[PDB]
Symmetry: D2
Subunit: 388 residues, 4 copies
């Protein structure tokens, strides 16, 4: 009815999102820089719950320890003034030229040691600001050519780095968990751990896997042509959806980071349906870039639209699931039977069950339509508000 967000909806934004100045590989900045304090204040006015940051977004690279304390205190006063929270933070291991061949998996060992120290420094700061999740996006971990990177040795180095970070937070007693953010490419030709599945598999080889989950981004899995709600379902099934980055992407091309709801709208519908039906309770974080065509009024419009589109889709997905005609259609398509065990009776009874093979009427079973198109048109009508 009214799609007004409140801090209760847990919407969060990175400083680097509304603060993106619009520099792209072919053009100069179109907007001036935003003071972090100014972004916190404007986002609070729009109904956001909190903000996130990379170390270098908050404290400019090379800052003296005294300049550092000054930047943090001003930030903390804006948070106190507005009620905004800081649920996640991350490290910039991709902008400075020293990270041109990676941070944790750089071929040069001294760069890998520096990347870990820069990371540990910001974990301390994140805990101080109350963050519960620490994200890692290995944007420069990867290669443009085959001989440049032995990927088994690089995964060893990646494992070593995350194991050391887990040792660090456990030895310090911190209540923070790690979330790896996959991306298949850009800025490297191929990035290691390119999808949610590769990241989930990797985590199972860490020494303390319970401290690590994923931070998937809508557009990154779509850059590989994959179904984002399906990957999120697999992450939820594994118990590893620790955080999520929401935005939009129009297919397989450069990372667009459009506002949430733009891009593949039906995938956004099915994502919100899943998050809300699974009871995901973390932040709904937007990692987006207001297009460089926009002035600052367009930046705030784009940020507001992120939140608005989430709340419209939440209403439509709830109306879909609550509709008795949809519930009947779900039974007609046997979603109830999918949720029942195949063989709770056990292996031996399955083998002795002649109705499962010797006397199974395969032709009768094959003729049964699944009724999925009528179900999908009910979902389309609900999304478009065309139920009457």
């Amino acid at each position: 009815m009214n799609y007004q967000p409140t801090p209760e909806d847990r919407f969060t934004f990175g400083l680097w999102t509304v603060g993106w100045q619009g520099r792209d590989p072919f053009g100069d900045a179109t907007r001036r820089a935003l003071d972090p304090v100014e972004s916190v204040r404007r986002l609070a006015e729009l109904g956001a719950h909190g903000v996130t940051f990379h170390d270098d977004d908050l404290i400019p690279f090379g800052s003296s320890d005294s300049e550092r304390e000054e930047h943090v205190k001003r930030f903390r006063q804006a948070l106190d003034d507005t009620g905004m929270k800081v649920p996640m933070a991350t490290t910039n291991l991709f902008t400075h030229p020293v990270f041109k061949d990676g941070g944790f998996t750089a071929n040069d060992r001294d760069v890998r040691r520096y990347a870990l120290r820069k990371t540990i420094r910001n974990i301390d700061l994140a805990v101080e600001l109350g963050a519960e999740t620490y994200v890692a996006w290995g944007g420069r971990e990867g290669a443009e050519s085959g001989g440049a990177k032995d990927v088994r040795d690089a995964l060893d180095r990646m494992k070593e780095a995350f194991d050391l970070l887990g040792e660090y937070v456990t030895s310090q007693g911190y209540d923070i968990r790690f979330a790896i953010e996959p991306k298949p490419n850009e800025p490297r030709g191929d990035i290691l751990l390119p999808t949610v599945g590769h990241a989930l598999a990797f985590i199972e080889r860490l020494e303390r896997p319970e401290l690590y989950g994923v931070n998937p981004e809508v557009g990154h899995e779509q850059m590989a042509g994959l179904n984002f709600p399906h990957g999120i379902a697999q992450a939820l099934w594994a118990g590893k959806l620790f955080h999520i980055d929401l935005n939009g992407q129009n297919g397989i091309k450069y990372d667009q980071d459009l506002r949430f709801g733009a891009g593949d709208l039906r995938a956004a519908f099915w994502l919100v349906d899943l998050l809300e039906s699974a009871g995901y309770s973390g932040p709904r974080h937007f990692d987006f870039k207001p297009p460089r065509t926009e002035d600052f009024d367009g930046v705030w419009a784009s940020a507001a639209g992120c939140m608005r589109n989430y709340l419209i889709l939440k209403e439509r997905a709830a109306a879909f699931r609550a509709d008795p005609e949809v519930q009947e259609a779900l039974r007609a398509s046997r979603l109830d039977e999918l949720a029942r065990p195949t063989a709770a009776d056990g292996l031996q009874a399955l083998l002795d069950d002649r109705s499962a093979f010797e006397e199974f009427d395969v032709d009768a079973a094959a003729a049964r339509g699944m009724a999925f198109e009528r179900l999908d048109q009910l979902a389309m009508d609900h999304l478009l508000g065309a139920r009457g």
Copy 2:
């Protein structure tokens, strides 16, 4: 010098590859069916090591137990006559209309029970023929629309199915392992476990993960735009590369299944380099389709070219790694340093090491070129046989 294969090179082919009759979604078959015995004999003459099969390739669907024994005995006599082996087998859970919504994750429970019994029947046959690996490709597990498949319930059903199959082989005492073959799409709109990473992650949630690995296919990961040698490296790092399907693919489109070496030739070079340097010792299996333009002479030509291209690339990758100028280039690009631990000295010494942060010269480190382009041009010259 001479690129002649021998059974020692372990090249294997599925019956369904050379026997593909050329039916595609827009056209009729262009070739008559091949008798399996005839394929075994022709492949042996070409230097292959063995063949693989789906149950329905060897025994036509619906066969009586007596027709079954007859088809198997003829096959076994061809194997005895030629020295050919059968290292892998698999189940067809995708062609019959009863599998239109899947086998293990079909919404209908009776279809899921039938799919397991059809599978178990062929595992027994595979063990009898001496197969060491049983492949599962869930070609119909997936969906064209969002509401048709709850993916968490479907992963529960998938886990239940593989757990029951593991219970079966362990209770029977069989020495066979399972290999899941990922594919991102086609014939379903999205297929569950779409990439090597999703399959590896899934396996870690099975009750006896040691019985399960992956069977990646070159073209399937490329249908998601991913780097196949990188995914194979991750599978090798995890200890899960139990088998591999070799073929070629020209980018993101329908599954072409071209002969190996066609498609992305440099990725084929880097794949062979990795397999041979990691000492992969399983079968080099070709899952390919000779194009429907071809008559049977072109089918055998295409099969021979699979083997030929592997052996040329093996020679070029070995020449690359053995070249002293390449070894010097690898050190110049610090591949030796990538293989050294980042912090064997431990967390505490890293934190107290001022050379890792307080006194690290980031500008000096940043200026060091990685020399990857000279290394990659040496690899190009070796691939093209242009070293002089």
Copy 3:
């Protein structure tokens, strides 16, 4: 309010769409064949305006001249009984094995001559049934490998074929125009004239270009990652949008042919906006496949949903353009200025205009935001029926 189609909405369907039996490259048919007469009757009941056909959909391949006349007369009686029209027809030059290397650009000259005679035979039949457009989809014109097809010689052969067909219809006095339907790949590895742009360029080299236009399909341009409404705009700008195939596609992969509205929903919105604002008056033809999961009740549901989704999107696009707040936003984003000539004053006055260069304030111009994000969120709200 009520999204009921009538024959006035000009919705048409190919016989091969609702009649697709569900055979795909990995599985058998899931539905029995439909008699063309039965499809005409069922589609009329749903509110369709007419049907289209390939020669081989209506008259089975190899039919005797007498069997032929019989199939046509039964069809014509169904059309008379229902009021259905036949606005377009086409030729099947892709299913029979003789067309495995193409019809018009087959390397074998005798096949190319046969393809033209099979085509001419059906043009006569289409005119008899009252078709105004004859579509050509060169599904097999192309190659899997580089040496198999000299593309300059193949374009010569393609031009020769269309020139001869134009000579034929002009010599017979027929009032029919030709529409080339591009597709980038599938079933050939690469298909010639792969996009709307390549087809439009080709037409300009024909002897009588006025007889030829394009028949773009939503999903085909999306298989190349292109923006379909943009390509349709270019076709409309050139005066060549003679017909259109509507369906849905989820990105770059095999040709899904989903029902219209599925796939990229926002692109469907912008397509309907363009067609209706440009006053396109041809048929709105659905070239779709009801998924093979469906029985015949699902086939009719899917066909009805094609029409329903067009009419919902038509209502939302009209509400968008009629909204005074949207009209103000369009002026704020200077769409009115885009439609004004850049230099109606002429070249010399442009060169002497110091306000265009010497005294142009580039910094002031650069600071002006384009306001596109607020405009796009108004379009999203209209699409979702969330204006209040």
Copy 4:
């Protein structure tokens, strides 16, 4: 034997290629700027024939008329000192913020007039330096959202701009032709005239089409998944290949601009085969970026590798076509018959030829294999230097 380039091989490089400082959307520059004079000298030493430039690469934006003359004179002295030529130039209408919504199709009319004056100024300079081709890449012409750009009005504006530029060069008497460079996306979400086909079609609607051709880039057509040699063949067939940009791209993702030969190596082979067999005589221009991992020694290595790989592939493609076994294979696959007219006898004799339809043996024709796989393996063996 020796793959040493000489100026006779006509290899050219843009100033912006070797001079790319390595700034990407996620990171800072890794290399200092190169003085244009220094690049001219280094490229001459490597065997290049000439260089190309955007206006802003040579003369920094905002330069005074006196600073301008100074930059040009220094450049001209380097050209005189080295023998280097300047065969092409272009305009930068994409970096400055004023071009954020385009140059020729910007919604703001005053920006469109400025873009034309900036262009005309550099055409005069290009003619002075002896360029024969003027390239236009409309990198910012396009949109991220549907309502922001009416594409018919934008094509009107694009046509108006190129028509005015043609009026200008004809009124000045200049001997220069225009080449439009297509790209499907990046930096805009969708770019207008996204492929070679759309550009060729557009040119036919200009007032003086003979002055305009295309400048295709390998990686740009591959960003749409298209076959670059096929698109080049269509451009050659139309008589419009006025220039070409050579580089490499690994599939559908961000524009990588790798050195030529990297990316899809077999497509590079077939491109060189086509260019050399068609007798293309323009510049072989590399539009590439040495990866930001590299220092200046790696920049020159990467530039040299562009030239080296062209010359290796030229030798292998010539060996392929000269091989008598390949010539026999081409006849076996009926490439000779593809080049013969389908119906030089004319329409009426085709209609009366019973051997073309009534008495055509379609089954006999269908059984003939095309022998394309043996031909393609000969091409692979030649590419890899594996003929013995």
